[PDB]
From a paper:
We and others have shown that A. fumigatus effects dithiol gliotoxin S-methylation via a methyltransferase, gliotoxin thiomethyltransferase A (GtmA or TmtA) located outside the gliotoxin gene cluster. GtmA consists of two domains, a larger ‘upper’ domain containing a Rossmann-fold involved in binding the co-substrate SAM and a smaller ‘lower’ domain that changes its relative position to the upper domain in the three crystal structures described here. apo-GtmA seems to be highly flexible, as indicated by the higher B-factors. In agreement with Duell et al., who have recently published the structure of a GtmA–SAH complex in the same crystal form as described here, the cofactor binding site of GtmA is located in the upper part of a cleft between the two domains built by helix α1, sheet β2 and loop regions connecting β1–α2 and β3–β4. Our data suggest that GtmA methylates dithiol gliotoxin by a non-processive mechanism.
In order to obtain detailed insights into the enzymatic mechanism of GtmA-catalysed methyltransfer, we crystallized GtmA in the cofactor-free form and in complex with SAM and SAH, and refined the structures at 1.66 Å, 2.28 Å and 1.33 Å resolution with R-factors of Rapo = 16.8, RSAM = 19.2, RSAH = 13.9, and Rfree-values of Rfreeapo = 18.6, RfreeSAM = 23.4, RfreeSAM = 16.6, respectively. The apo form crystallized in space group P62 with one chain in the asymmetric unit, whereas the complexes appeared in two different crystal forms belonging to space group P21 with two monomers as the asymmetric unit in both cases. The flexibility is more pronounced in the lower domain, which is also evident by the finding that almost no ordered water molecules can be observed in the electron density of this region. The apo structure adopts a similar conformation as the SAH complex; however, parts of the upper domain (the first 22 residues of the N-terminus including parts of α1 and residues 86–114, including the complete secondary structure elements β3 and α4), are not visible in the electron density. In order to investigate possible structural rearrangements and gain mechanistic insights into this transformation, we structurally elucidated the GtmA-apo, GtmA–SAM and GtmA–SAH-bound structures. These structures revealed several flexible parts of the upper domain (α1, α4 and β3) which are not visible in the electron density of the apo structure. Interestingly, the two important residues Ala54 and Asp82 are part of β-strands β1 and β2, two regions connected by a disulfide bridge formed by Cys55 and Cys80 in the apo structure. This disulfide bridge appears to be reduced in the cofactor-bound structures, leading to a movement of the two β-strands towards the cofactor. We investigated the possible relevance of the disulfide bridge by carrying out microscale thermophoresis (MST) to determine the affinity of GtmA for SAM under reducing and oxidizing conditions; however, the affinity of GtmA for SAM was similar in both cases.
Numbering used by the authors: 23 to 85, 115 to 287
Write the structure that this text describes.
């Protein structure tokens, strides 16, 4: 996964304005080290500061001082929080006046289509989430520019911008297969009867591997295409 989220790490740091802001000293939060675990771009940006008065904190919003930070980053965190609204309220609380929230969330990605295609090789017209069904399983709305803009503005953010950014990369079959099998076990309970699972669950790995080897060569690459929403907002 991390080859693609690393591309979005540069986008999110650039869109936030942190490298060029007049707010000094920089007091930054990287939620759950979501950027730092996949990219050095933010850490390296701070290292390049002439000042040396800046601070970066990595910690988790999902359980910080009031009015403290100049920048809060949430890289692909809002769709996974237990309580996305509570987390957003916390972002507003811990930002200083003039502080910027920058977040990335998923709007589209191609791994659900590829999995669906593999599954419609099984006999039985078996059900599988569509791309929108899958996104909406947790914290629905964070794939919608209009939803996000209103959620941020309700809480007092202004100059709110929500921009879709497509990125494309490629991943080896073996790695793409393993990402799939982290997701499959989580879905089938929600979309198949126990009758359908006992009947077909055990063969999913083989057909998936078979479809993947079928389609993208034997040691080939699988494309990873996505659209992420890049959200920025100002706390007045």
């Amino acid at each position: 996964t991390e080859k693609l989220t690393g591309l979005y790490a540069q986008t999110l740091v650039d869109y936030s304005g942190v490298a060029n802001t007049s707010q000094k000293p920089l007091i930054v939060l990287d939620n759950a080290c979501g950027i730092g675990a996949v990219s050095s771009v933010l850490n390296h940006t701070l290292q390049d500061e002439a000042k040396k008065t800046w601070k970066l904190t990595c910690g988790d919003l999902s359980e910080l001082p009031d009015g403290h930070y100049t920048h809060v980053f949430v890289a692909f965190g809002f769709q996974s929080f237990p309580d996305a609204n509570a987390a957003l309220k916390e972002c507003f609380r811990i930002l200083a006046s003039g502080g910027i929230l920058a977040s990335s969330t998923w709007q589209n990605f191609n791994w659900i289509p590829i999995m669906k295609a593999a599954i419609e090789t099984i006999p039985g017209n078996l059900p599988f989430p569509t791309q929108k069904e899958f996104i909406a399983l947790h914290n629905a709305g964070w794939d919608s520019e209009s939803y996000i803009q209103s959620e941020l503005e309700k809480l007092g953010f202004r100059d709110v911008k929500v921009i879709p950014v497509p990125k494309e990369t490629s991943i080896p079959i073996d790695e793409f297969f393993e990402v799939c099998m982290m997701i499959i076990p989580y879905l089938l309970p929600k979309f198949w009867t126990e009758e359908q699972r006992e009947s077909h669950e055990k063969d999913v790995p083989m057909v998936l591997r078979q479809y993947l080897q079928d389609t993208y060569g034997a040691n080939g690459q699988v494309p990873l295409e996505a659209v992420a929403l890049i959200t920025t907002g100002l706390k007045p």
